[PDB]
Amino acid sequence: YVKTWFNQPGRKLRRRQARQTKAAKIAPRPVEAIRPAVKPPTIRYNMKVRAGRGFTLEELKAAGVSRRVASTIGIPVDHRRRNRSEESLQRNVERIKVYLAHLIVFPRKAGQPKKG
């Protein structure tokens, strides 16, 4: 049982081509969703900062975005992560606020029945 990496330049170009069709389908929105900033859970890397999965419910409510719409404007949700330190709430709320600063939202046509 042996594996060869001859398709390594083939697979990389397939991935790039897979990104370009995604960009074609969804033009204005970025090819990647926003991710939060979290700290690795170990004494070795705890002083580091990296990306998370999504923004917890305290990070959404504090920033001012409901949890239902957040999934629609590209902000992802992590029901499992929680905020134990306020610096973790702060680094990710401002991460949301800077995102909503640059976020153009296209209006959608809405059904308007004659009566009500």
Partner 1 sequence: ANPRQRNKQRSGKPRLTRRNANKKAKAKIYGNFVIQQNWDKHATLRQNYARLGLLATPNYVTGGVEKLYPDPDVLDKEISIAPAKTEVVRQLEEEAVKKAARQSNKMLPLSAFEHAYIQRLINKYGTEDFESMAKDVKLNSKLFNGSKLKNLYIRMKA
Partner 2 sequence: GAYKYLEELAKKKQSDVNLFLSRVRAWEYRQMNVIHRASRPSRPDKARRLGYKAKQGYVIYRIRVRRGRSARCTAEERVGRYCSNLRVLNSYWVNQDATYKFFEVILVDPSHKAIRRDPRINWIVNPVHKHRESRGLTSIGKKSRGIGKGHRFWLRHNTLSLRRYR
Partner 3 sequence: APGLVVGLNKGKTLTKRQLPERPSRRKGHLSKRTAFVRSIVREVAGFAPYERRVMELIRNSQDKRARKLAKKRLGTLKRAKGKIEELTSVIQSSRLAH
Partner RNA sequence: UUGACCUCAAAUCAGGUAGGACUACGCGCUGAACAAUAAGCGCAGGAAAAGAAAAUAACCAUGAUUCCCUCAGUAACGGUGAAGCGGGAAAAGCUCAAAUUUGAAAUCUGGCAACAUUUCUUUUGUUGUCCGAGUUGUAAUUUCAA
Partner RNA sequence: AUUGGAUAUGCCAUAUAAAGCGCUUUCGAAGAGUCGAGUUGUUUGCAGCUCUAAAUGGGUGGUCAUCUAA
Partner RNA sequence: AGAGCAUAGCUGUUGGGACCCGAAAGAUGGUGAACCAUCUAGUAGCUGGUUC
Q: Which residues bind partner 1 (CB under 8 A)?
A: 16-17, 19-21, 23-28, 30-32, 34-35, 51, 62, 90, 93-94, 97-102, 104-107, 109-110, 112, 114-116
Our finding on whether 73 is near RNA (CB under 7 A) is no
Q: Which of 7, 13, 15, 94 binds RNA (CB under 7 A)?
A: 15
CB atoms within 10 A of CB 77: 17
Q: CA quadruple 35, 38, 41, 46: dihedral positive or negative?
A: positive
Q: Among candidates 103, 27, 111, which has minimal Cα distance to 63?
A: 103
Distance CA(77)–CA(94), nearest Å, equals 16
φ, ψ of residue 38 to 5 degrees: the values are -135, 170
Q: Which of 44, 101, 102, 104 binds RNA (CB under 7 A)?
A: 44
Any residues with CB less than 8 A from the CB of 59 and at least 6 apart, and which? 36, 83, 89, 92, 93, 96
Residue 99 touches which of partner 1, RNA, partner 2, none (Cβ within 5-8 Å per kind): partner 1
- Does residue 7 sit in helix, strand or coil? coil
Query: Applying CB under 7 A, which residues contact RNA?
Result: 15, 18-19, 22, 25, 32-33, 35, 38-48, 50-54, 57, 61, 66-69, 71, 76-85, 87-88, 108-109, 111-116
Contact footprint for partner 3 (CB under 8 A): 34-35, 37, 39, 47-51, 82-87, 89, 91, 95, 98-99, 101-102
